Amino acid sequence: TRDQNGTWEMESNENFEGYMKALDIDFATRKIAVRLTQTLVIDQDGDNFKVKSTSTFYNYDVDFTVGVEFDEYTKSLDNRHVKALVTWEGDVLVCVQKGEKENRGWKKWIEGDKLYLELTCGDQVCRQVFKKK
Numbered sequence: 585t586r587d588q589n590g591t592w593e594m595e596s597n598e599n600f601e602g603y604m605k606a607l608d609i610d611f612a613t614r615k616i617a618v619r620l621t622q623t624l625v626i627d628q629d630g631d632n633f634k635v636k637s638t639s640t641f642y643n644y645d646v647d648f649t650v651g652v653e654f655d656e657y658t659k660s661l662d663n664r665h666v667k668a669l670v671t672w673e674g675d676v677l678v679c680v681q682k683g684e685k686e687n688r689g690w691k692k693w694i695e696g697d698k699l700y701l702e703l704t705c706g707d708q709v710c711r712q713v714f715k716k717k
């Protein structure tokens with residue numbers, strides 16, 4: 585399946601530290617962030633996505649259209665400008681963020697009753713598994 589709608593609660597988080605470090609997020613933010621359960625709210629209508637992740641102390645909001653390039657100012661994260669593009673490979677959703685960092689982006693897919701998120705930056709791979717609320 586390609587359907588990723590829902591409110592998703594984090595079950596496991598393998599190597600989040602490794603990924604955040606590759607982005608140059610400040611240590612103080614990293615230490616707090618690795619302990620926190622995330623609630624991911626995905627609103628997917630055709631090719632239009634509105635994604636909100638929230639925790640006790642941090643917000644992450646982004647709106648995008650699949651197959652349409654867009655200029656991003658990553659305000660709350662690392663404060664950079666990137667040219668972003670999101671597409672499909674079989675049943676895997678693939679984002680490439682073109683800019684300074686290499687291999688920057690992510691992949692999301694389903695196997696059984698879980699959502700896999702693979703976040704990449706450089707030579708690091710973070711694997712997160714979520715289950716539906």
Ligand SMILES: *C/C=C(\C)c1ccc(-c2ccc(N(C)C)cc2)s1
Binds near residue numbers: 624637661690692
């Ligand atoms: C496709 C889903 C993506 C890219 C994300 C979901 C949560 C994200 C996130 C949460 C929190 C932080 N910090 C720095 C607290 C960064 C990213 S990205």
